[PDB]
Amino acid sequence: SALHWRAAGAATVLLVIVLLAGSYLAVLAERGAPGAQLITYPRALFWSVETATTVGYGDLYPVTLWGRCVAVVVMVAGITSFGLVTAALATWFVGREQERRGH
């Protein structure tokens, strides 16, 4: 237990929370706009995972302003989560290399 780990953990928790909330809020914003395919929860969930992990298939994109704000939230949160976990891994390897040597 250090910090890079103790921050990657919080990033993971908060990402899970944002995927759930984004599913819910995306459904809540998409319903009411004719033509919206993003209007049930179980696929707002898989859409949130495909969007946060920057995959973007493109079969269930949001079509409203608030739905798109929710999408931007999910995108930024996922990018931050994974970049921060990458930083954590880098710090761990730096430590282990500052020991294979001395400094």
Epitope: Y24, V27, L28, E30, R31, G32, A33, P34, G35, A36, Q37, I39, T40, Y41, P42
Partner: antibody, heavy 118, light 108 residues
Framework: QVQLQQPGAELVKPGASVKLSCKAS????????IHWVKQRPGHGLEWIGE????????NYNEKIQKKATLTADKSSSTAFMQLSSLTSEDSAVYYC???????????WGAGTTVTVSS | DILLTQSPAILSVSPGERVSFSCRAS??????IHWYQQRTNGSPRLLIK???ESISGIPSRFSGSGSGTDFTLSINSVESEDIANYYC?????????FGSGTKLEIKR
């Protein structure tokens, strides 16, 4: 058991407002939407509007007359529809259905035979 | 919106026999179609969810199939209790829509 509970009938003089009530026992999740379905005599089913109570957001059939107003109630798990100022065309059995946010109407109510006549 | 067309509106069948209602959506919607039943002065009964999935309390008599734009609701061995009106309802794009309906007649 019986979960959605609707008054049997309503009579309104042609022009007033009518406020339909639908009360739900059983489970009440936060992901429950409440839909309304107008069924004219001799016609099929026609989707009117939906509302999520655990937030209070309502959508209304933008392709037919959008006179109504769906409202919610925090505790008792009861929803209201505000069909105000009608003609004699707005006379139908009005169903409320519960949807778990997964698209299909699991449970319906008994309906409310709403009658417009002087 | 999405147009659900149900041909024909009236379908007559002799008892103990396989009737097949049909629903056709105005654009591909995958399997987001759901079959309801309603008898005279009754309320809708969810028969099938997502094209081909069962509901508790629904007999094995009722099947359900199809995907994309064409969907089918079948009944092996019709019997008098099946005399009702059958609707399809889609949940793929907003708003949800219903079908025009279809009546089951039994020639006895």
């Amino acid at each position: 058991q019986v979960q959605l509970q609707q008054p049997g009938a309503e009579l309104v003089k042609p022009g007033a407002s009518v406020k339909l009530s639908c009360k739900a026992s059983g489970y009440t999740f936060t992901s429950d939407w409440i839909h309304w379905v107008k069924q004219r005599p001799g016609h099929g089913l026609e989707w009117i509007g939906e509302i999520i109570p655990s937030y209070g957001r309502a959508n209304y059939n933008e392709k037919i007359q959008k006179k109504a107003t769906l409202t919610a109630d925090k505790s008792s798990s009861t929803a209201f529809m505000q069909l105000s100022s009608l003609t004699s065309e707005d006379s139908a059995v009005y169903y409320c259905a519960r949807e778990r946010g997964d698209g299909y109407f699991a449970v319906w109510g008994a309906g409310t035979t709403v009658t417009v006549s002087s | 919106d999405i147009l659900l067309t149900q041909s024909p509106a009236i379908l007559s069948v002799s008892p103990g026999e396989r009737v097949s209602f049909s629903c056709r959506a105005s654009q591909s919607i995958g399997t987001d179609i759901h079959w309801y039943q309603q008898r005279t002065n009754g309320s809708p009964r969810l028969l099938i969810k997502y094209a081909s999935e069962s509901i508790s309390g629904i007999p094995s008599r009722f099947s359900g199939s199809g995907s994309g734009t064409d969907f089918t609701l079948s009944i092996n061995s019709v019997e008098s209790e099946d005399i009702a009106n059958y609707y399809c309802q889609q949940s793929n794009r907003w708003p949800f829509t219903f079908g025009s309906g279809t009546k089951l007649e039994i020639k006895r």
